[PDB]
Design a protein around this ligand. Structure first.
Ligand code: ZN
Lengths: 44, 52, 42
C-alpha cells in the first residue's frame, strides 16, 4: 500500500483535494485534525 | 552623578593590619556598550542582546 | 542552511559550533525556507 511520511490526496469527501501527510491516519498540511481513512480514499 | 558617588566614599587608608597604604579613586568614565567576538569587538545593539 | 542575522550569509551548521556567522562573527543565525509546497485552505 503506502509508507510512513507519504504525501497523499483526499479523493472523495467533504475534505476533497486536500493534501495531507500520513502520520502513521493522515494529518493535513495546515489544519489540526487527524483524520483516518482507508486506501480507496487516498491518492498520490 | 556617578562621579558624586565616588567623590564621597573617599580615600581609604588601608589598615596597618608598620605600613600605611592609601587608595585614591578619581575620575570615573563609562564606555559605550560592546561585545567581544573572538578577537574582534563588534557593536552590541539592544536587539542582539535580547536574542543572545 | 542558516542565514546570518546581520548580513546575509548562509552556511551549513556544524554540531557544537558556537553559532557564529563565520564571516562576520555576530552570533545570531536564522533557518531558511526551502521550496516545499504548503496548502492553505482559504
Ligand atoms: Zn554575517
Amino acid at each position: 500500500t503506502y509508507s510512513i511520511g507519504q504525501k497523499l490526496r483526499i479523493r472523495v469527501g467533504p475534505l476533497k483535494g486536500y493534501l495531507c501527510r500520513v502520520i502513521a491516519t493522515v494529518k493535513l498540511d495546515s489544519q489540526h485534525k487527524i483524520f483516518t481513512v482507508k486506501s480507496e480514499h487516498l491518492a498520490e | 552623578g556617578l562621579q558624586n558617588v565616588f567623590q564621597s566614599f573617599g580615600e581609604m587608608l588601608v589598615e596597618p593590619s608598620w605600613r600605611y597604604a592609601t587608595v585614591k579613586f578619581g575620575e570615573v568614565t563609562v564606555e559605550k556598550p560592546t561585545f567581544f567576538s573572538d578577537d574582534k569587538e563588534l557593536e552590541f545593539l539592544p536587539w542582539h542582546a535580547r536574542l543572545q | 542552511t542558516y542565514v546570518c542575522g546581520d548580513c546575509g550569509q548562509e552556511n551549513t551548521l556544524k554540531s557544537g559550533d558556537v553559532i557564529q556567522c563565520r564571516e562576520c562573527g555576530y552570533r545570531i543565525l536564522y533557518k531558511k525556507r526551502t521550496r516545499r509546497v504548503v496548502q492553505y485552505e482559504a
